Amino acid sequence: PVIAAPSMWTRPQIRDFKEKIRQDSDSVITVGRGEVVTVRVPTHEEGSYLFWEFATDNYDIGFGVYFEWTKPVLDEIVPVYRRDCHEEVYAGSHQYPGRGVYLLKFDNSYSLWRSKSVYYRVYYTR
Amino acid sequence: GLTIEAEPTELSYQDALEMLAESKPVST
Ligand SMILES: OC[C@H]1O[C@@H](O)[C@H](O)[C@@H](O)[C@@H]1O
């Protein structure tokens, strides 16, 4: 196989983003102290791309992305790194390498005392 | 170790508007 590079960008309107997100309660995750939440996003049949947006309250969080081919095979789309997504909205896109499941890693494992509040959206498009 | 399953939603012209507004790139 061969993998396309992802595209990632930030945008300034964090309060608005969070308010919009908060109009749905299943779009808000609490990542415990020292814990890692994995969001599994299967590839849509009607789409060729994954799109993600996310933000946090008052503290950074590690974010990264893997692709699980459908024991299994994993490719590293985005490396896990701490992002200041408490200050800006973080977002990105990746072209489907094929049929499979995307793994969004929200990684709080380095945080002893602080939970993290994660606001996120995932999309597909052609 | 928690694992959530999300079904992605079709990206819309509206969604895409906001996302693009005052966008700044990023590298890793
Ligand atoms: O890119 C190098 C790849 O090496 C493989 O062993 C790993 O499964 C991936 O995490 C990584 O993407």
Side-chain angles (χ1 to χ4, degrees), chain A residues 1-14 16-19 21-70 72-126, chain B residues 1-23 25-28:
Chain A
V2 67
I3 273 73
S7 193
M8 297 184 60
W9 61 90
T10 50
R11 65 180 175 93
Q13 324 85 346
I14 190 161
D16 297 347
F17 172 74
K18 285 198 275 223
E19 192 193 22
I21 297 295
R22 205 150 37 210
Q23 298 304 318
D24 198 278
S25 184
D26 272 321
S27 275
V28 179
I29 292 180
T30 294
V31 183
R33 52 191 179 82
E35 275 183 353
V36 186
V37 180
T38 299
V39 178
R40 293 180 61 84
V41 186
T43 48
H44 211 279
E45 223 63 48
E46 299 312 326
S48 50
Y49 288 87
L50 167 66
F51 261 82
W52 66 84
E53 293 184 298
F54 69 97
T56 57
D57 289 337
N58 308 321
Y59 298 117
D60 63 7
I61 196 172
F63 171 82
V65 187
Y66 293 85
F67 187 88
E68 184 180 86
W69 293 91
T70 286
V73 188
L74 293 173
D75 267 292
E76 191 185 42
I77 314 307
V78 177
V80 176
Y81 275 144
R82 287 164 69 163
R83 317 286 176 167
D84 294 316
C85 53
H86 59 311
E87 300 179 352
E88 285 185 315
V89 185
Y90 272 72
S93 76
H94 188 251
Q95 185 169 355
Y96 290 176
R99 200 149 298 166
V101 185
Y102 275 88
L103 303 185
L104 273 56
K105 296 289 191 185
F106 296 107
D107 194 323
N108 203 27
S109 75
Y110 62 93
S111 176
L112 294 168
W113 319 105
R114 305 301 185 204
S115 275
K116 303 293 170 70
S117 298
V118 175
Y119 306 76
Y120 85 101
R121 275 250 166 84
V122 291
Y123 317 85
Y124 75 93
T125 180
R126 267 142 263 171
Chain B
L2 179 64
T3 300
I4 304 302
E5 288 177 11
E7 198 62 26
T9 68
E10 188 181 303
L11 192 78
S12 78
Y13 183 27
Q14 172 102 52
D15 296 315
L17 279 176
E18 302 167 1
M19 315 207 323
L20 170 59
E22 263 159 321
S23 295
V26 167
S27 302
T28 316

